[PDB]
Amino acid sequence: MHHHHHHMVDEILKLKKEKGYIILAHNYQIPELQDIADFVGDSLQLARKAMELSEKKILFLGVDFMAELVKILNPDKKVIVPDRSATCPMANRLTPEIIREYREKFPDAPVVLYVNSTSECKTLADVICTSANAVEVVKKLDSSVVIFGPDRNLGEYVAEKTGKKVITIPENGHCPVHQFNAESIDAVRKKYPDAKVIVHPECPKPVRDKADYVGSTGQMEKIPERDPSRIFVIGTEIGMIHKLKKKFPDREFVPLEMAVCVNMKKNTLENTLHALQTESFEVILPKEVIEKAKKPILRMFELMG
Ligand code: SF4
Numbered sequence: 001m002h003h004h005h006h007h008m009v010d011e012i013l014k015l016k017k018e019k020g021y022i023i024l025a026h027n028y029q030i031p032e033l034q035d036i037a038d039f040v041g042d043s044l045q046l047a048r049k050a051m052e053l054s055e056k057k058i059l060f061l062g063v064d065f066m067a068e069l070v071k072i073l074n075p076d077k078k079v080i081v082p083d084r085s086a087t088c089p090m091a092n093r094l095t096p097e098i099i100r101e102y103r104e105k106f107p108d109a110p111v112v113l114y115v116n117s118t119s120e121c122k123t124l125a126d127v128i129c130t131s132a133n134a135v136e137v138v139k140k141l142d143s144s145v146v147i148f149g150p151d152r153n154l155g156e157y158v159a160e161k162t163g164k165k166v167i168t169i170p171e172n173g174h175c176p177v178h179q180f181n182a183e184s185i186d187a188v189r190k191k192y193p194d195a196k197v198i199v200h201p202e203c204p205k206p207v208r209d210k211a212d213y214v215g216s217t218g219q220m221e222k223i224p225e226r227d228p229s230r231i232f233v234i235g236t237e238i239g240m241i242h243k244l245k246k247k248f249p250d251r252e253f254v255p256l257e258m259a260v261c262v263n264m265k266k267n268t269l270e271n272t273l274h275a276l277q278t279e280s281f282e283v284i285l286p287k288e289v290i291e292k293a294k295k296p297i298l299r300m301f302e303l304m305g
């Protein structure tokens with residue numbers, strides 16, 4: 001890397017060791033930040049890993065609902081973030097008011113909230129799910145009808161796999177990063193006839209349908225353990241390409257299209273250094289939010305394994 005960035009990385013690691021921080025980074029952080037992190041993964045993987053740590057201070061590198069997820073499950077640890085504006089546009093479009101409107105219209109349908117959702121919305125969820133476990137969570141629920149949000153694509157995917165009725169909220173709730181074009185897959189089928197295409201379930205239906213595999217980032221990681229393909233084309237955010245290439249240096253990983261989450265890219269070497277220097281910004285939740293949000297997480301845990 002550029003020599004100046006090297007010096008920033010060195011000072012970041014000096015400060016985190018000095019001040020007793022563990023650094024957690026999401027799969028979609030820039031490579032330089034994945035590289036300095038102690039652990040890199042999806043939101044739940046990170047929140048759970050943190051629960052095993054003896055350190056009491058976490059520098060979280062991702063977006064707000066994820067840092068808050070870490071805080072909800074590690075409420076006695078100090079969690080900081082470099083940029084308080086780093087957020088999830090898809091998650092923020094669902095509001096507690098919208099959930100309320102739907103609970104009343106469909107009083108016998110459990111509210112299943114994807115982990116990509118604001119902490120406030122989680123207080124009103126019956127159960128949380130991840131993109132990896134959503135299908136099995138919904139299958140295990142006794143109701144044949146669920147309210148599901150905030151992603152319409154994941155909801156629709158769940159409906160296909162479970163055969164249950166899924167009422168997705170809010171209307172056209174989606175992730176823009178995962179809105180790949182189906183013709184991009186057609187182009188890879190011609191270019192790389194032996195490559196396997198793996199996409200996220202937040203992708204739209206004709207993208208999912210043309211893929212060899214549909215899975216969460218955690219699932220993408222595991223696929224090349226068993227699949228012997230030399231080339232994987234990956235339908236998710238570009239940060240995952242770095243993660244995959246590091247894990248499987250013997251294969252190639254091609255992004256299906258260049259997809260960048262602007263909010264994820266808000267964290268930089270500069271503001272990560274500043275966060276360790278100043279130990280800001282702390283993630284602080286009202287007690288009511290930590291307790292209420294935690295219940296549908298715990299319920300997910302109960303249903304799932
Ligand atoms: S990638 Fe899509 S889902 Fe993940 S944070 Fe960015 S917008 Fe939200």
Ligand SMILES: [Zn+2]
Binds near residue numbers: 001002003
């Ligand atoms: Zn260099």
